[PDB]
Design a protein around this nucleic acid. Sequence first.
RNA 1: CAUCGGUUCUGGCGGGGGGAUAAAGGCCCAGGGAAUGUGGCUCCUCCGGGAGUGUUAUAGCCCUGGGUGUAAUACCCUCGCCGGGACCGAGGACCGCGCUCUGCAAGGAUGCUGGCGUAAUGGUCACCAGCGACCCGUCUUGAAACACGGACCAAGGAGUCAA
RNA 2: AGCGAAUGAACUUUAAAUAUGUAAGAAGCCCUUGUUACUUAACUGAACGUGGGCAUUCGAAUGUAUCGACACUAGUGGGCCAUUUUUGGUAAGCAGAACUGGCGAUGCGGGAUGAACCGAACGCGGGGUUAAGGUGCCGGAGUGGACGCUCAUCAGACACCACAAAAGGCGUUAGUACAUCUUGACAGCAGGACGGUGGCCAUGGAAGUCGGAAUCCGCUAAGGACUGUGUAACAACUCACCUGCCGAAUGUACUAGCCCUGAAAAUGGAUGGCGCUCAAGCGU
RNA 3: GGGAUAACUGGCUUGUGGCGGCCAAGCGUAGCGACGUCGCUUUUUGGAUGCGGCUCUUCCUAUCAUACCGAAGCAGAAUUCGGUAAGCGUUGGAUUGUUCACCCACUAAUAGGGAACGUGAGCUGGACCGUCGUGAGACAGGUUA
RNA 4: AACGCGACGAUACUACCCGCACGUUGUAGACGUAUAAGAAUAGGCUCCGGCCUCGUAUCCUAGCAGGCGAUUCCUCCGCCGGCCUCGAAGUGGCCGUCGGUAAUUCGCGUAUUGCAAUUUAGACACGCGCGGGAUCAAAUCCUUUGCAGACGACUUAGAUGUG
Lengths: 245, 30, 174, 190
Amino acid sequence: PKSKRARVYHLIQVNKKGREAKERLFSNIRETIPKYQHCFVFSVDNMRNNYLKDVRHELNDCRIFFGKTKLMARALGTTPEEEQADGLHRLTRYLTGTVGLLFTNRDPADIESYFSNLSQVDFARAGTVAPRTVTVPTGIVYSTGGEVPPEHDVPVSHTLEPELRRLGMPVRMIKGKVCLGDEKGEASEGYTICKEGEVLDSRQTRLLKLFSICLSEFKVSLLGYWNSASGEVTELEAGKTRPKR
Amino acid sequence: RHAQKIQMRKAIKQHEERNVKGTAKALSSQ
Amino acid sequence: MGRLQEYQVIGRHLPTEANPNPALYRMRIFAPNEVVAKSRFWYFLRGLKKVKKATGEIVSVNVISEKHPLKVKNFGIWLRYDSRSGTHNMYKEYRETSRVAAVEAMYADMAARHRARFRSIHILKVVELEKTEDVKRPYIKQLVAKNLSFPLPHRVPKISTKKIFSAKRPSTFS
Amino acid sequence: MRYIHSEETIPVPENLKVSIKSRLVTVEGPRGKLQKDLSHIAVNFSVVKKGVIGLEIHHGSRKDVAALRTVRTIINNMIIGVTKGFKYKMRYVYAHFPINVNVEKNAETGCYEVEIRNFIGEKIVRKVVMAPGVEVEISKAQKDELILSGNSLEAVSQSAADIQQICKVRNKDIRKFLDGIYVSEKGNIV
RNA sequence: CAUCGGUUCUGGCGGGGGGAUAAAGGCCCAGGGAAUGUGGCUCCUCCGGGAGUGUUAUAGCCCUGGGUGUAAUACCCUCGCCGGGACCGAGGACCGCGCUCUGCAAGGAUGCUGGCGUAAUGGUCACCAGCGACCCGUCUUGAAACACGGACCAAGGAGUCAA
RNA sequence: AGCGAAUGAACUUUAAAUAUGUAAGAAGCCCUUGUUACUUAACUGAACGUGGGCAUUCGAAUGUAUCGACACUAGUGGGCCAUUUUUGGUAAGCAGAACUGGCGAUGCGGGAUGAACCGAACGCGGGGUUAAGGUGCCGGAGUGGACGCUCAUCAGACACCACAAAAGGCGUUAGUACAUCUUGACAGCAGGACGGUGGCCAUGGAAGUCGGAAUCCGCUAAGGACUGUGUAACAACUCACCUGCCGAAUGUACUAGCCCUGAAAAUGGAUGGCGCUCAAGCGU
RNA sequence: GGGAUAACUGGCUUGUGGCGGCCAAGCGUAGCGACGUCGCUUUUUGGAUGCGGCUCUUCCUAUCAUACCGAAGCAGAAUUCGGUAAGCGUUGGAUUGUUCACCCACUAAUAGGGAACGUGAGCUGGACCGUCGUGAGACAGGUUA
RNA sequence: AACGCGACGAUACUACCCGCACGUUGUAGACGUAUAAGAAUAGGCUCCGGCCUCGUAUCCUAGCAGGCGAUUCCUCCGCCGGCCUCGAAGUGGCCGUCGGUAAUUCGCGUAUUGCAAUUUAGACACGCGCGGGAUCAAAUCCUUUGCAGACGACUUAGAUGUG
């Protein structure tokens, strides 16, 4: 009845895709399966995954899928009777959560070497344990939060001032400059954003992203793969300790 | 509020149409 | 309304030389008594076909009673009621022991919720839901919920209305 | 539509003790003792497991079940207050006149009095009395800041709002005069 | 107070008929069906309570035909029999209709008994109480409203006589 | 109704509702032949008569507290309101005809009150039962029963006419249609929201967001030559869209009840009053 | 000269114009149609009015001031709009037959109304006939509320 | 509040208080006029066993309108004293004395009011009587005053004194 919230009808140019997009996903996976010899299942547990585009550009000659997990599972087939190819159903069993497919015409050892040598620094992300203590210096705060030398740094922005306050540093606006305490220092002590060995909240993660300080590492973890010629799936170390479907 | 809701409904309908899609003054002036 | 019973009426146009042995129309209705049953049958037949009271007769009127008035049934009533805007359809559900009780409750509920009266309500089809999965309304769903047990909190005691004064403050627990 | 049964559940920590009378709720723990009357809402309190309390409404309406969501969060707020407590960090800023804040506790009535002086040059002293059970301090961790902590979230929040309202600017430009005492951080002591 | 007549109000009891010769329901008989699944087994953060396979099993239920049965009952309509109360008693030899005919509840109340036999019943004035209740006449109008006359009492006071 | 009958309100086999005129027997119809100054080619027609026919259901029902004719005599010549039908008109009012009904000259019960409403007409009494209307006493009779709805910062208690609508409610209940959901719906939280590209023109400067026009491609899970915040420009945030967690029903527009608003002045007062909230309000 | 009509408003009044086109939910199966927008009034350079006026009582709020709020380039000062509020106060000059407008002055400001067809209480500043003319009227002619 | 109330002083007469003889005295109306927890109602009570819809409960209730006498009973009731208690518009308990008293049973009387006729029977209030204690007053008028005043009214003063 009445006493209900009214959601805004957005003046936008893109709308929700839904079933016909799920259908393109089905068609693309089913047309991709026969074209390649090996299918890898990889996992990206707690990473921002904005480096997947560079991974794609590097493996331009490989077809990588990262969609909704249940849709990918059912496109691959969940039962031995609805499989497109033999055993893609038990590869669906490795396909459990924040995972992706990788169809290749290449050698499993070369794929594993690439994704074992590939590693890039990324922002903390919520839930990760802090590997360090990051505290801002007392005084005028800069755009890096006292990580690069201050003499080679630019002050943080007055439009990030109110956002920085809502994230929780007692910082003030003196003469157009954001400073913690007083401009000449003294005043107050520093603000320790994160402590060693402590689960980081989204507040702290947003603080770290605003200060452009990276604490986490992006690494794709290959859970397993499947060769079509033998019709056989091989487990690479990861799935013995990662929960399965 | 009647005028405002009529305006909002017209704006919503016009936006839906345009998102789906991919003289008397002259005589009087003379 | 009142006390009702099922009344099944067959009536036919009066025989003539042109069309002997007429169609013998029949329908089942709800009336407090047989006179009202026949009047409603003739009104409905005038509304549907081109047969009138004067040019017709009542072949039979019988009371349909329930097959099993002792077992709890769920009834779906599809009805049409005319309000100030026009004619509107409703499907409503009632948990009773008889189609008579279902229709009684339906008249009462329509009067209470929409101020629709007897000549403003038309009974189009009353059915007994043969099994669950045929109930669509949350109240009868919660009535047919498994292992249904509930207390009766704040039960006002039934004191005689001539007992003006009491010596103890009454309790509302049992 | 007269729902036959609607149930809610509140879990309890190991180190707390909840004693609930007809509709009085009393909670004890490491931090202290909090009591509240809920006699204005119809509810049956129950135990379903070792460490969870249950709240139910029979033959109720959506208003009744909505009360059951409020009754839970209020009791949950009391449990959190007795386990970890509540704390409000407030900051006072000024442009030309330093705001002088004096916090003391009187032996009589056992309350905390906060006195504000020199709010944009006013000669009037502004005295605010705290609700009982509230501790107010000027912490030497940051300058121009105050910490108001306690057991009851309602009392702590109402006290913070009381200081914020008493330091209000009148007949001036809101965009120009930026002086006052404002709630900056909200959280728990532990 | 008892026995009666007239009118009337209000309780109980005994049958009859009808209806789908109620519908149901109990109880046997046969045939199907299913779930808000009667036991078991598997799993299950085990005082406990749940998910899965599992249809009469250590509960039952639904539908259909048959019997018992011309069952019971409700409901509608009917034929009677008892109880309590109220108000009334008109007429004054016989005739008449009758019946249950030594007689009678049959064309209208008699029998028995008590207190008092006087303000006791009853009636009239004054007041109280409950309810009810615009100040009369004239005039106009469809009607009101208005207007007119009315300080009180006594006597007089207005369709008569002749052609 | 049909046009699988023809033809096309002006079509019809048939035929509604609704009021309405005439007639329903001895106070009769005919048939038959005598007259006539009428008439006809004519005992031929018309009128005046004879005979017959049914006296019993003699020519439907129902009522019938009698009807008709003559003579004489008194008071009367106004209208008002309303239903239905009907003509005209206005912004709305309203005006005019016809029928019937209430008032006169009419008392009584009810509607608190009252020309125009509902019931019912009248000698004086006793008893019984009802109408309209009522049963929280005032006030005789129910704080009767069954199912629901409603909380009003002067509700409502029969006014439904006005204000007044395609009106305003994030009040509440019932319903209709359409759409999405274990191929994970609504809401949320943690993340992505990228590249050609500081896309073309203009401006001192304008990079998606002071302006004009087009408004594409790739990667795709998806991302607008961008929905807002922000910079002098950047930058940065955010939205759109997408993924992971959660887990089962949601959510858009209409409809129907009751409720709030939909306009108010001036001595202090009115559902009759007190007062009434699972009512002493509304519907059956 | 005759006839009808013979007072009249009484949940009346108040802030947002009318005409035509487009659009338009319903209804309806063409006709009706709200809100908006466009065209006319309407744009490219900054006197009207033809019964009035004083003292006192009371009421309304449709609030001028005083009190408190929300918004505004609201720096301060002075303000503007709007909300709750009637407790408390609430004018004078010039001109005109009078009134308002405009203007001029103090003042915190110097608001608008009701006392119910007699607009609080008190006070002040004609129609009928007759004669004679008819292209218009006259009468110290008569009668009368 | 001149028809709301409280505290206190003095109260001559009258009879102020006390006991009964009562009243042909009044009463919107005796006839067992019997009964104190508080508080909640989505809870409570308790003797701590348990109990709670239910005041259709508890107390009291026999005797010539309630006589007289016994076996037996220490239970109930009332009046006076003492100690305390109750003030929202004022009472109850404990002790004591004194009087009455079916928990059981029995005896001697009831008649005749004549077949019903309010079973005149309670309380408070008021009034006449005795015999016991006690008390022994004011106001108004008059004169005067002027803190007052239309007239009334009001503040004052007249008994041996600061008159």
